[PDB]
Amino acid sequence: MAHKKAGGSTRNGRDSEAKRLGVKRFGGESVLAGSIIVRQRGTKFHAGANVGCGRDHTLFAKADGKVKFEVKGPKNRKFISIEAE
Amino acid sequence: VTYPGNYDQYLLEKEEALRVEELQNAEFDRKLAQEEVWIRQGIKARRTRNEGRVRALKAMRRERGERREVMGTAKM
Amino acid sequence: GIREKIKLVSSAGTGHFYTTTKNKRTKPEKLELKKFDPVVRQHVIYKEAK
Amino acid sequence: PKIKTVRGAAKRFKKTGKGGFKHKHANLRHILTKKATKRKRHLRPKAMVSKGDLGLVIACLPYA
């Protein structure tokens, strides 16, 4: 009897680890110096006042304060800035 | 490798080294040729296809990254 | 895996070396770069080696 | 009998002043041309055994 029929394979089915990108400190959060605000892959958020940009385009605080999200600019490109507290 | 005798001796002894090495080079390809008909052969009913021969074939395919005995008689 | 590892032994005598890679079949010349030598704490000329 | 110590762990950990254990950072034996200098100089100092691993070391070293 022909009970069990042969089956094919799948050419794909491999993937990679998740990089946990995103915003780590949302607006209105009092944050210390040198800490990480948002993890990027490009630059969806640019660096405003008192913040910097790593080689990964990671945005980090420079001096302590509050987190501010703003949309200044001719091309409506979003920034992040930190106040003075 | 060194050689004894006058100059014409070397030409004779070198040609034997080239001929023999040509003779053994073809024999190695002969085994590897018939060890690739076997890798893609059907298994049969409930047999396993010994991996003491699949790994050896893996070592034969890897060994083919070796020197090409004839430099190639450049054509012009 | 064409590139081969090499090291740059210091000319300042103090046994020191940076290591790097080099495409040896397209770069017959030997590197000679000026880099820090922490033993003598000066910028000297580093020449290629093994 | 006395509890035999695990001689392999006694060569890798050393008890500190408040009951902790110091070890030597891994990944600094060979293949050292690839790694960035920032990475190597950070594995040079000693380290502290984490809270999760703490249970497995006090078991291996009963006399120290």
Added chain:
Amino acid sequence: GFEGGQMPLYRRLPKFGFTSRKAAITAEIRLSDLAKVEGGVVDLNTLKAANIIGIQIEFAKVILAGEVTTPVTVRGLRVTKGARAAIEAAGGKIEE
């Protein structure tokens, strides 16, 4: 130290250091410990005769680890520069 099959913590990390034979024959003396030995002379023998360091210990050091009252003449030892400031105060002579 069996982690289920993966390399255990004590084989995953490298060995370091070397144990010294010299550190097994030295010791430390507390400053509160100088009032126990004898009529006022401190040496290797005057301590190890008072059950203060091991009989097979040939070096010693006196650290600022208490409070000394009586003047004592440390015959030959390696008093630190903090306990020296506490032995000369009480009236103690220090030599080699």
Added chain:
RNA sequence: UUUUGUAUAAUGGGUCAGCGACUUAUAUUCUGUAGCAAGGUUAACCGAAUAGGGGAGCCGAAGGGAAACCGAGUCUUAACU
């Protein structure tokens, strides 16, 4: 009993009586309790011997460094804000 799940047609037991399964030596850490307290305690052995001797030793009051070494500091480093 084992299971996601058993009246289960899944396991075991015919019934009664007797027997039958988390122990013992040494070592190490934590908790309670007792004695002493910057001290605590003896081992073998001696002993008219559960007394009394015996303090050989062990833990603790100091740590840092791979180590020499320094020491309430020490290590790294040419030096650390």
Added chain:
RNA sequence: AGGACCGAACCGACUAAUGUUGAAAAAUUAGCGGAUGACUUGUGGCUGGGGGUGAAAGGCCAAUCAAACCGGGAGAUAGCU
């Protein structure tokens, strides 16, 4: 004359039925093959366990054999019931 013929003792075991907690841990009844041969049988010997013996089936070696039985290592080990 003959590893000739038919055929009881003797040796074996092809078919069928009964028996399968049997009369019997392989037998009984009815037939069945060899029956002067490479036959069959009594008594006593010899070959010992990774070994023997085997006209060869992994057969037999005390109703047990792809490595006997007895004692010991021994309370082997069991991530399994």
Added chain:
RNA sequence: GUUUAUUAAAAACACAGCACUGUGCAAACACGAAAGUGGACGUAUACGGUGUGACGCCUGCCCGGUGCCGGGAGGUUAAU
């Protein structure tokens, strides 16, 4: 003719016959740490192994592979 004592008696095993191969005798070969023993109180028209299997006609091609036999220069190669 023999065989699975106890589910298989056969086309399986043996066989007389054939071929190959080893053995010159203190034979090859086998049982034995060894002495020794069987072969054999035998001597190549004999003994051992291997395959085939009365008798009749026959038994074709391949020495590349893996084995075995002969070689004795060269290359590689141990202890000393």
Added chain:
RNA sequence: CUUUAAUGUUUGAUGUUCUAACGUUGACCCGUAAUCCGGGUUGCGGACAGUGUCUGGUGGGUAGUUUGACUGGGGCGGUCUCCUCCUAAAGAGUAACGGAGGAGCACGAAGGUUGGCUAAUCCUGGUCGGACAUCAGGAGGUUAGUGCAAUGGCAUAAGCCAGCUUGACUGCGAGCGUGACGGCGCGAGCAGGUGCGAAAGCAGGUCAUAGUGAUCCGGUGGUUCUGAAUGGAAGGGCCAUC
């Protein structure tokens, strides 16, 4: 001293000759009522054979064991680590033998700075010359480009070109992110030297995310840290690296 030729004289390799080791499962004699043994007399081999220690080859004759997991039962087929997108339900994460592709590198410039610049594509005109080459001016505005996949980005360019160059530095590092851990990552700022720029400044590799391997063991360079009586040394340790 560089080639060379003999007498010897040490032994080294092949050859032959002898006897005294050794062999005799040849003959004879004795212990001996004895086809074992021992001894003696002779014959034949003879420094061979054989045995002992060391050594290369062969050696399923024998022995001990190994021979992965996932899986829509097992075998066969496929896969096993790393990167990108969807599934993934607008923070993070999230499975299937779900749907699609990639990596195991490259680069002493393709890196650092200081200057300057801006594409695709179509239309029109023009020698060969064209559907598509170079050229000119128009529309258009990144539909182009990026060393190599996909995604996110990029005009202040992160794309294109040129000059000078070695920061593709040494010691550290507040504070964070992500993991059960091992680990992985981003980092202002401090000190020592350096490059470019007139300076303000920027530079601890490359637009970012793959381009990779623990520990043990050993090799190479440096360093009085240690050095089993003492002075060395060996051998260990620390730093850089294979």
